[PDB]
Amino acid sequence: QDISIGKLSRLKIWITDNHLSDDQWSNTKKFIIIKITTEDGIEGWGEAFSINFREKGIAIIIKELFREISNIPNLSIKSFYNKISLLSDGHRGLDFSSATSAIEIALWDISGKLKNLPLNSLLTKSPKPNVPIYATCWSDLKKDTNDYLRQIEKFYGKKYGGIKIYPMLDSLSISIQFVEKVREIVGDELPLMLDLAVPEDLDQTKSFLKEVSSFNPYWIEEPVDGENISLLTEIKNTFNMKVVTGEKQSGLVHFRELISRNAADIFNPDISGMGGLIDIIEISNEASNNGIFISPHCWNSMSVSASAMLHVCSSIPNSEKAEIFPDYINFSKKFCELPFDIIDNKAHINKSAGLGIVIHEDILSELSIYSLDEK
């Protein structure tokens, strides 16, 4: 992190268009992927957590930050981090944190290349070679319950380390019947994660959690808004179930308040959304000292973001299962020779330098709706 990178010379940004999967399950979100090249010709890849209607705004922020840091002759990951601290002056938000994550991730990739080390080897002496994963089952398109059940059975056959579903439906009985039907497929052994996605009615959430405990969910994600610290503590303390929060927030101070208030058991900040890897690792360590696990959120491409997450999870003692969107794999494969492979419940990651990213830029450009290249 104190590795001298030198001066930055070039920035390219792609924003991919939405793409319908071959099986028609879902459309990909627009991804924001960046490549930074140093004066010495070293390339690093980054990815920003993309947010609907804000992708171009995030990309513009990245370009403005790049301009500001690009003539710093002794840039390092740490000095970038410190410059951002100064510039930001305590004004925080997800869009800004996504922009800084993309740049910082690229600097980590470059630093790996400079040391001839995979990112996980930069982070710890003895990283884990295989990373437990789980699969998220979600679509942007309207589905009926049987549509989901069919997709879930497909996931079950792949032998992922777990499956995450979104069970908050039109009514309590329908929601719990969905959970029961999923259990009919996966059995009682498989980690089954439940993403409640911040239900608007707290009483509906309380009834659901009262009714679902018999199905032994592996975790309960976002039962209330992440800034509702008091209700997270209450929920966590009322039900015996592991509470996950963090995907929609960023910055150390928020997560330190979650720790102080015993508000969650697992944090899931987005790998490309927290602000960068320095803060992901720092909160991972603090969490580990307080019995909290880290399961980075990764609603991003299965290329750059996914590699960053796998490296981080392989480097920390308190990782939980890492998030995969199987329906995003084939699209990511179009332009990226992926630096990992999935065998049953684990991803085996690159031992090559940095993030191990090999992207066919011509294809990435073909798939993009917006771009930037800037010396």
Site string for Mg ion, 232-261 (x = CB under 5 A): ---------------x--------------
- What count of residues does the chain have? 375
The token pair that represents 243 in the structure block: 């509470």
Q: Return the residue of 45, 96, 328, 335 that touches its own copies, per CB under 8 A.
A: 96
Site string for Mg ion, 187-206 (x = CB under 5 A): --------x-----------
Q: Write out the DSSP string of 13-79.
A: EEEEPP-B-TTSS-BPPPPEEEEEEETT--EEEEEEPP-TTTHHHHHHHHHHHHHHHTT-TTB-HHH
Q: How far is the CB of 54 from its own copies (least distance, A)?
A: 5
Q: How far is the CB of 222 from Mg ion (least distance, A)?
A: 5
Q: Return the residue of 53, 142, 146, 362 that touches its own copies, per CB under 8 A.
A: 53
Exposed e or buried b for every residue in 208-247, given b needs 16+ CB within 10 A? bbeebeeeebbbbbbbbebebbebbbbbbeebebbbbbbb
In 3D, which of 334, 307, 373, 320 has the Cα closest to residue 120? 307
Residue 286 binding its own copies, by CB under 8 A = no
| Distance (Å, whole) CA 23 – CA 151 | 10
Residue 262 binding Mg ion, by CB under 5 A = yes
The token pair that represents 58 in the structure block: 């995030």
Question: Hunting for tokens 């999923």 — which residue is that?
Answer: 182
Q: Write out the DSSP string of 244-282.
A: EE-TT--SHHHHHHHHHTT--SEE--BTTTSS-HHHHHH
Residues 66 and 374: beta-carbon distance below 8 Å: yes
Residue 199 binding its own copies, by CB under 8 A = no
Q: How many helices (H) and strands (E) does the chain have?
A: 13, 14
Site string for its own copies, 218-257 (x = CB under 8 A): -------xxxxxx-----------------x-xx-xx-xx
**Which of Mg ion, its own copies, none does residue 371 bind to, with CB < 5 to 8 Å depending on kind?**
none
Query: Among residues 147 and 227, whose Cβ is nearest to its own copies?
Result: 227
# chain residues binding its own copies, by CB under 8 A: 40
**Which of its own copies, Mg ion, none does residue 195 bind to, with CB < 5 to 8 Å depending on kind?**
Mg ion
Both ends of the chain: CA-CA distance in Å?
24
Site string for its own copies, 59-78 (x = CB under 8 A): -xx--xx--x----------
Q: How far is the CB of 187 from its own copies (least distance, A)?
A: 32
Q: Which residues lie near its own copies (CB under 8 A)?
A: 51-54, 56-58, 60-61, 64-65, 68, 87-97, 99, 198, 225-230, 248, 250-251, 253-254, 256-257, 260-261
Q: Which residues lie near Mg ion (CB under 5 A)?
A: 195, 221, 247, 262, 290
